[PDB]
């Protein structure tokens, strides 16, 4: 769809929300009109000033333009979603949704990420050096958490059918980044959601959905490393997958401030270790570099205890294995842990 399509639509679009969007606002128990308009304006002084401080005053006009198109995208997708939702569950109100500041901050942030990313390289011009505001940047700007942001991505994508394949991919990668580390940082509401679940059952569709995507991503990466390093032993992987899967779910504190991939690599090693299969970390670490995520910092600088970081090998020996020693050994035991279902589709 002409790589310029959506941006074309956006450039043509009006700055004020449509008669129909305003109509959704007027049918809410609590009118969100004023809040959404003010938020748009407030986040505007903030996005524009932070953006300008990223690229410079000579480029003030570009921040405004990024913002303008992002807000148009915001209203556009918002309206799209409300129609899909009205249709989905025939209701028409939506006060609960439209009055949720977090929802609105995530739609906006996601819309700003699209406009931002499509013009990335162009913005990267007149930028250069150690100031390349990739993705987490936009979250940093709106004081918005990665776990919240992630909640709008799949929906945002299904709501804007004119996203370039290039934009679709970027949004997808953003969600992957969240899943691999951003969502597990100590400032992440995910931990309040988890603890809530471990405690009082029921609720949180967002956590259930989060994990579904983590497991899928987790397995995919795991499977890639196995196809490369463990062709000789196919029975592994499923066993490695089980420890990996069991660990994220029941040993999630291991993930706090750490990386999905660190737990993955440590799962592979540990299981090969008890199953008497070579596999040095040196090997694992080398294949890992073949993964779309893969950066060296991830196995070179691993959180140990305090703000103390060390090699992934130190993490494995001092924390990982020490924390999971007995579980790992159960895999080589007479009654092996029931294998965990491989994530599908």
């Amino acid at each position: 769809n002409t790589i310029q399509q959506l941006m074309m639509i956006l450039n043509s679009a009006s700055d004020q929300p449509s008669e129909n969007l305003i109509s959704y606002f007027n049918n809410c128990t609590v009118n969100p009109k004023e809040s959404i308009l003010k938020r748009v304006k407030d986040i505007g002084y903030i996005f524009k000033e932070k953006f300008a401080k990223a690229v410079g005053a000579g480029c003030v006009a570009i921040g405004s333009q990024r913002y303008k198109l992002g807000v148009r995208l915001y209203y556009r997708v918002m309206e799209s979603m409300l129609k899909s939702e009205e249709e989905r569950l025939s209701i028409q109100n939506f006060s609960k949704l439209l009055n949720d500041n977090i929802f609105h901050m995530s739609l906006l942030a996601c819309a700003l990420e699209v406009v931002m990313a499509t013009y990335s390289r162009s913005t990267s011009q007149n930028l250069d050096s150690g100031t390349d505001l990739s993705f987490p940047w936009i979250l940093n700007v709106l004081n918005l958490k990665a776990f919240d942001f992630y909640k709008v991505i799949e929906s945002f994508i299904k709501a804007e059918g004119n996203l370039t394949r290039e934009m679709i991919k970027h949004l997808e990668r953003c969600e992957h980044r969240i899943m691999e580390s951003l969502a597990w940082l100590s400032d992440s509401p995910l931990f309040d959601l988890i603890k809530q679940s471990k405690t009082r059952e029921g609720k949180s569709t967002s956590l259930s959905l989060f994990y579904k995507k983590v497991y899928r991503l987790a397995y995919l990466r795991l499977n890639t490393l196995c196809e490369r390093l463990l062709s000789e032993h196919p029975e592994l992987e499923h066993i490695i997958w089980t420890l990996f899967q069991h660990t994220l779910q029941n040993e999630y504190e291991l993930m706090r401030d750490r990386h999905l991939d660190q737990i993955m690599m440590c799962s592979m090693y540990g299981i090969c270790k008890v199953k008497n299969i070579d596999l040095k970390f040196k090997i694992i670490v080398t294949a890992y570099k073949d993964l779309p995520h893969a950066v060296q910092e991830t196995f070179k600088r691993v959180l140990i205890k305090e703000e103390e970081y060390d090699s992934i090998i130190v993490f494995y020996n001092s924390v990982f294995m020490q924390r999971l020693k007995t579980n790992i050994l159960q895999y080589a035991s007479t009654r092996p842990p029931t294998l965990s279902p491989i994530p599908h589709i």
């Binding site: 979603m81 899909s84 939702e85 989905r88 569950l89 939506f94 609960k96 949704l97 949720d100 977090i102 929802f103 995530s106 909640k151 709008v152 799949e154 929906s155 299904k158 709501a159 991919k169 997808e172 969600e175 569709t205 967002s206 959905l209 579904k212 995507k213 899928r216 991503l217 995919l220 994530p343 589709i345």
Partner: peptide, 18 residues
């Protein structure tokens, strides 16, 4: 593509925000 469309049938964005 590796992306996982996680929303089950009829789940929508409303089921993700309060």
């Amino acid at each position: 593509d590796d992306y996982l469309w996680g929303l089950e049938a009829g789940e929508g964005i409303s089921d993700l925000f309060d």
